[PDB]
Amino acid sequence: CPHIRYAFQNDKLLLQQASVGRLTLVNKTTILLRPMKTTTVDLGLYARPPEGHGLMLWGSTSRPVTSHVGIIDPGYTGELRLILQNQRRYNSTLRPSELKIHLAAFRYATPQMGPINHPQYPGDVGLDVSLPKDLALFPHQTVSVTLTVPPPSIPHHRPTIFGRSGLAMQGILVKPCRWRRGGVDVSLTNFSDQTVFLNKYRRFCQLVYLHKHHLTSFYSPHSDAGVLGPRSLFRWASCTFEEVPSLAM
Protein backbone atom coordinates (compact mmCIF):
# COMPACT_ATOMS: atom_id res chain seq x y z
CA CYS A 1 0.00 0.00 0.00
CA PRO A 2 1.36 3.39 -1.06
CA HIS A 3 0.70 6.63 0.69
CA ILE A 4 -2.50 8.00 2.13
CA ARG A 5 -2.16 11.73 1.52
CA TYR A 6 -3.76 13.87 4.20
CA ALA A 7 -4.11 17.28 5.72
CA PHE A 8 -5.16 18.12 9.25
CA GLN A 9 -5.78 21.37 10.99
CA ASN A 10 -8.07 21.68 14.01
CA ASP A 11 -6.91 23.24 17.27
CA LYS A 12 -9.66 21.40 19.22
CA LEU A 13 -8.20 17.97 18.29
CA LEU A 14 -4.72 16.52 18.81
CA LEU A 15 -2.94 14.31 16.30
CA GLN A 16 -1.91 11.50 18.65
CA GLN A 17 -0.07 9.51 15.98
CA ALA A 18 -0.05 8.33 12.37
CA SER A 19 1.50 4.89 12.64
CA VAL A 20 1.24 1.52 10.94
CA GLY A 21 -1.44 2.81 8.58
CA ARG A 22 -3.82 4.36 11.15
CA LEU A 23 -4.15 8.03 12.03
CA THR A 24 -5.58 8.82 15.46
CA LEU A 25 -6.94 12.10 16.78
CA VAL A 26 -8.07 12.83 20.32
CA ASN A 27 -10.30 15.59 21.65
CA LYS A 28 -8.54 18.42 23.47
CA THR A 29 -11.79 20.08 24.61
CA THR A 30 -15.03 18.85 26.14
CA ILE A 31 -17.62 17.75 23.55
CA LEU A 32 -21.18 17.98 24.80
CA LEU A 33 -23.78 15.55 23.50
CA ARG A 34 -27.35 16.64 24.03
CA PRO A 35 -29.79 13.78 24.43
CA MET A 36 -32.02 12.82 21.50
CA LYS A 37 -29.88 14.85 19.08
CA THR A 38 -26.99 14.27 16.70
CA THR A 39 -23.55 15.64 17.53
CA THR A 40 -21.22 16.11 14.57
CA VAL A 41 -17.51 16.75 14.95
CA ASP A 42 -16.01 18.66 12.03
CA LEU A 43 -12.54 17.09 11.99
CA GLY A 44 -10.53 19.53 9.89
CA LEU A 45 -9.21 16.35 8.28
CA TYR A 46 -8.88 15.67 4.54
CA ALA A 47 -7.53 12.47 3.03
CA ARG A 48 -7.03 10.57 -0.22
CA PRO A 49 -6.41 6.80 -0.34
CA PRO A 50 -4.14 5.06 -2.77
CA GLU A 51 -5.42 3.12 -5.71
CA GLY A 52 -7.68 0.19 -4.88
CA HIS A 53 -8.47 1.41 -1.36
CA GLY A 54 -11.15 3.25 0.56
CA LEU A 55 -10.85 4.77 4.02
CA MET A 56 -12.61 3.81 7.23
CA LEU A 57 -13.41 6.50 9.84
CA TRP A 58 -14.51 5.54 13.33
CA GLY A 59 -14.66 6.75 16.90
CA SER A 60 -13.79 4.93 20.12
CA THR A 61 -14.80 5.88 23.67
CA SER A 62 -15.69 4.19 26.96
CA ARG A 63 -18.38 6.81 27.50
CA PRO A 64 -22.09 6.15 26.65
CA VAL A 65 -21.76 7.56 23.12
CA THR A 66 -22.03 5.61 19.81
CA SER A 67 -20.31 6.82 16.69
CA HIS A 68 -21.26 6.19 13.12
CA VAL A 69 -18.61 4.08 11.29
CA GLY A 70 -17.92 6.02 8.08
CA ILE A 71 -16.96 4.59 4.68
CA ILE A 72 -14.97 7.23 2.82
CA ASP A 73 -15.09 7.02 -0.95
CA PRO A 74 -11.87 7.34 -2.87
CA GLY A 75 -13.06 10.38 -4.86
CA TYR A 76 -14.08 12.31 -1.72
CA THR A 77 -12.08 15.51 -1.44
CA GLY A 78 -14.25 17.25 1.21
CA GLU A 79 -13.83 17.51 4.94
CA LEU A 80 -14.25 14.42 7.10
CA ARG A 81 -16.86 14.52 9.88
CA LEU A 82 -17.52 12.17 12.80
CA ILE A 83 -21.22 11.60 13.60
CA LEU A 84 -22.02 10.84 17.24
CA GLN A 85 -25.15 9.83 19.15
CA ASN A 86 -25.92 9.89 22.87
CA GLN A 87 -26.97 6.59 24.40
CA ARG A 88 -28.45 8.39 27.41
CA ARG A 89 -31.56 10.48 27.96
CA TYR A 90 -29.51 13.26 29.60
CA ASN A 91 -26.52 15.30 28.48
CA SER A 92 -23.36 13.20 28.05
CA THR A 93 -19.93 14.80 27.89
CA LEU A 94 -16.71 13.60 26.34
CA ARG A 95 -14.03 15.18 28.52
CA PRO A 96 -10.66 15.80 26.97
CA SER A 97 -8.99 12.64 25.80
CA GLU A 98 -12.17 10.55 26.11
CA LEU A 99 -12.80 10.41 22.33
CA LYS A 100 -10.40 8.79 19.91
CA ILE A 101 -10.99 9.20 16.19
CA HIS A 102 -9.34 6.76 13.77
CA LEU A 103 -8.75 6.76 10.01
CA ALA A 104 -7.25 3.87 8.07
CA ALA A 105 -7.40 2.29 4.60
CA PHE A 106 -8.72 -0.99 3.19
CA ARG A 107 -8.90 -2.76 -0.16
CA TYR A 108 -12.42 -3.28 -1.50
CA ALA A 109 -14.11 -4.80 -4.54
CA THR A 110 -17.22 -3.95 -6.54
CA PRO A 111 -19.61 -6.34 -8.34
CA GLN A 112 -21.50 -5.43 -11.49
CA MET A 113 -25.09 -6.71 -11.12
CA GLY A 114 -32.49 -3.71 -6.14
CA PRO A 115 -32.22 -4.84 -3.47
CA ILE A 116 -28.49 -4.22 -4.03
CA ASN A 117 -27.70 -1.06 -6.03
CA HIS A 118 -24.63 -0.07 -8.11
CA PRO A 119 -22.26 2.54 -6.60
CA GLN A 120 -23.62 6.03 -7.26
CA TYR A 121 -20.28 7.45 -8.48
CA PRO A 122 -17.16 5.89 -10.02
CA GLY A 123 -15.11 4.15 -7.39
CA ASP A 124 -17.74 4.53 -4.60
CA VAL A 125 -17.14 1.80 -2.08
CA GLY A 126 -20.61 0.80 -0.90
CA LEU A 127 -23.60 -0.54 -2.78
CA ASP A 128 -26.81 0.70 -1.30
CA VAL A 129 -29.20 -1.91 0.05
CA SER A 130 -32.98 -1.41 -0.16
CA LEU A 131 -35.34 -2.10 2.78
CA PRO A 132 -37.42 -5.21 2.21
CA LYS A 133 -40.41 -3.93 4.30
CA ASP A 134 -41.79 -0.75 5.97
CA LEU A 135 -40.34 -0.24 9.49
CA ALA A 136 -41.37 2.09 12.32
CA LEU A 137 -38.38 3.03 14.50
CA PHE A 138 -39.59 4.47 17.78
CA PRO A 139 -37.32 6.68 19.86
CA HIS A 140 -34.44 5.01 21.62
CA GLN A 141 -35.38 1.59 20.26
CA THR A 142 -33.56 -0.93 18.05
CA VAL A 143 -35.30 -2.65 15.10
CA SER A 144 -33.73 -5.49 13.15
CA VAL A 145 -34.31 -6.87 9.68
CA THR A 146 -32.84 -9.94 7.95
CA LEU A 147 -31.25 -9.98 4.49
CA THR A 148 -31.26 -13.63 3.35
CA VAL A 149 -30.71 -13.64 -0.48
CA PRO A 150 -26.93 -13.92 -0.91
CA PRO A 151 -25.03 -10.99 -2.39
CA PRO A 152 -22.73 -11.70 -5.32
CA SER A 153 -19.64 -13.72 -4.25
CA ILE A 154 -16.27 -12.06 -4.85
CA PRO A 155 -13.13 -14.16 -4.48
CA HIS A 156 -10.97 -13.25 -1.51
CA HIS A 157 -13.45 -10.62 -0.32
CA ARG A 158 -16.05 -10.62 2.44
CA PRO A 159 -19.44 -8.86 2.26
CA THR A 160 -20.15 -6.55 5.16
CA ILE A 161 -22.94 -4.10 5.99
CA PHE A 162 -22.31 -0.47 7.08
CA GLY A 163 -24.58 2.52 7.59
CA ARG A 164 -24.89 5.67 5.59
CA SER A 165 -24.25 9.23 6.81
CA GLY A 166 -27.64 10.68 5.88
CA LEU A 167 -29.61 8.38 8.14
CA ALA A 168 -26.91 8.71 10.84
CA MET A 169 -27.43 12.49 10.82
CA GLN A 170 -31.14 11.81 11.45
CA GLY A 171 -30.22 9.75 14.51
CA ILE A 172 -30.48 6.30 12.91
CA LEU A 173 -27.33 4.14 13.22
CA VAL A 174 -26.65 0.75 11.68
CA LYS A 175 -24.49 -1.66 13.63
CA PRO A 176 -21.83 -2.79 11.12
CA CYS A 177 -21.75 -6.51 10.62
CA ARG A 178 -20.52 -9.31 8.38
CA TRP A 179 -22.94 -10.73 5.84
CA ARG A 180 -22.17 -14.42 6.24
CA ARG A 181 -23.57 -17.16 4.04
CA GLY A 182 -26.91 -17.92 5.79
CA GLY A 183 -27.95 -14.23 5.94
CA VAL A 184 -27.40 -11.16 8.04
CA ASP A 185 -29.56 -9.52 10.75
CA VAL A 186 -29.12 -5.73 10.36
CA SER A 187 -29.92 -3.72 13.50
CA LEU A 188 -30.97 -0.05 13.27
CA THR A 189 -31.11 2.11 16.40
CA ASN A 190 -33.00 5.41 16.66
CA PHE A 191 -31.12 7.75 19.03
CA SER A 192 -33.58 10.62 18.34
CA ASP A 193 -36.83 11.71 19.95
CA GLN A 194 -38.80 11.25 16.67
CA THR A 195 -40.46 8.04 15.42
CA VAL A 196 -38.86 7.43 12.01
CA PHE A 197 -40.89 5.60 9.37
CA LEU A 198 -38.69 3.93 6.78
CA ASN A 199 -40.66 2.37 3.94
CA LYS A 200 -40.00 -0.68 1.77
CA TYR A 201 -37.32 -0.04 -0.87
CA ARG A 202 -35.71 2.79 1.14
CA ARG A 203 -31.89 2.62 1.00
CA PHE A 204 -31.05 1.87 4.63
CA CYS A 205 -27.47 0.59 4.64
CA GLN A 206 -24.64 -0.29 2.25
CA LEU A 207 -22.85 -3.40 1.23
CA VAL A 208 -19.03 -3.26 1.21
CA TYR A 209 -16.70 -6.04 0.07
CA LEU A 210 -13.65 -5.93 2.27
CA HIS A 211 -10.58 -7.86 1.17
CA LYS A 212 -10.39 -10.89 3.49
CA HIS A 213 -7.04 -9.67 4.89
CA HIS A 214 -8.92 -6.89 6.66
CA LEU A 215 -10.84 -9.24 8.93
CA THR A 216 -8.97 -11.05 11.73
CA SER A 217 -9.56 -12.71 15.08
CA PHE A 218 -6.26 -11.38 16.50
CA TYR A 219 -5.88 -8.34 18.67
CA SER A 220 -2.91 -6.13 18.03
CA PRO A 221 -1.79 -2.53 17.35
CA HIS A 222 -2.75 -3.38 13.74
CA SER A 223 -6.42 -4.21 14.40
CA ASP A 224 -9.46 -2.83 16.21
CA ALA A 225 -12.75 -4.25 17.49
CA GLY A 226 -14.46 -0.81 17.08
CA VAL A 227 -15.49 -1.21 13.51
CA LEU A 228 -17.47 -4.47 13.11
CA GLY A 229 -17.23 -5.73 16.64
CA PRO A 230 -15.12 -8.18 18.60
CA ARG A 231 -15.67 -11.33 16.53
CA SER A 232 -14.46 -9.72 13.30
CA LEU A 233 -11.68 -7.31 14.04
CA PHE A 234 -10.79 -4.75 11.40
CA ARG A 235 -7.17 -5.02 10.32
CA TRP A 236 -6.38 -2.00 8.10
CA ALA A 237 -3.95 -1.85 5.16
CA SER A 238 -0.33 -1.19 6.02
CA CYS A 239 -0.16 2.20 4.28
CA THR A 240 1.91 5.22 5.24
CA PHE A 241 0.32 8.60 5.91
CA GLU A 242 1.96 11.52 4.05
CA GLU A 243 1.00 15.09 5.03
CA VAL A 244 0.01 17.27 2.04
CA PRO A 245 -1.22 20.56 3.56
CA SER A 246 -2.77 21.80 0.27
CA LEU A 247 -5.50 19.14 0.66
CA ALA A 248 -7.11 21.27 3.38
CA MET A 249 -10.00 23.29 2.09
Ligand X SMILES: O=c1ccn([C@H]2C[C@H](O)[C@@H](COP(=O)(O)O)O2)c(=O)[nH]1
Residue stretches of the annotated binding site for substrate: 73, 81, 164-166
Residue number with CB closer to ligand X (68 or 102)? 68
Residue ranges of the alpha helices (H) in the chain? 165-169
The 10 Å Cβ neighbour count of residue 222 is: 17
Question: Nearest approach, Cβ of 170 to ligand X (angstroms)?
Answer: 12
Q: How far is the CB of 94 from ligand X (least distance, A)?
A: 17
> Which of 166/182 has CB closer to ligand X?
166
Binding site for ligand X (CB under 6 A): 57, 68, 70, 72-73, 76, 80-81, 83, 164-166
Compute the least distance from the CB of residue 195 to ligand X, in Å: 23
d(CA 215, CA 201): 30
Q: Mark out the alpha helices in 71-185 (DSSP H runs).
A: 165-169
Residues forming the annotated binding site?
73, 81, 164-166
Kindly state the smallest distance separating residue 35's Cβ from ligand X, in Å. Answer: 21
Q: Which is nearer to ligand X, 46 or 179 (CB)?
A: 46
Taking the complex as a whole, the smallest distance from the CB of residue 67 to ligand X amounts, in Å, to 8
Judge whether 212 and 205 are in contact, CB under 8 Å. Answer: no
Q: CA angle, corner 74, sides to 73 and 80, nearest 5?
A: 60
Please give the single-letter amino acid code of residue 49: P
Residue whose CB is less far from ligand X, 73 or 224: 73
Nearer of residues 21 and 176 to ligand X, judged by Cβ: 176
Q: 147 with 186: CB under 8 angstroms? A: yes
Q: Which residue's CB comes closest to ligand X?
A: 70
Assign 32 to helix, strand or coil: strand
Residues 162 and 227: beta-carbon distance below 8 Å: no
- What is the C-alpha separation between 55 and 43, in angstroms, rounded? 15
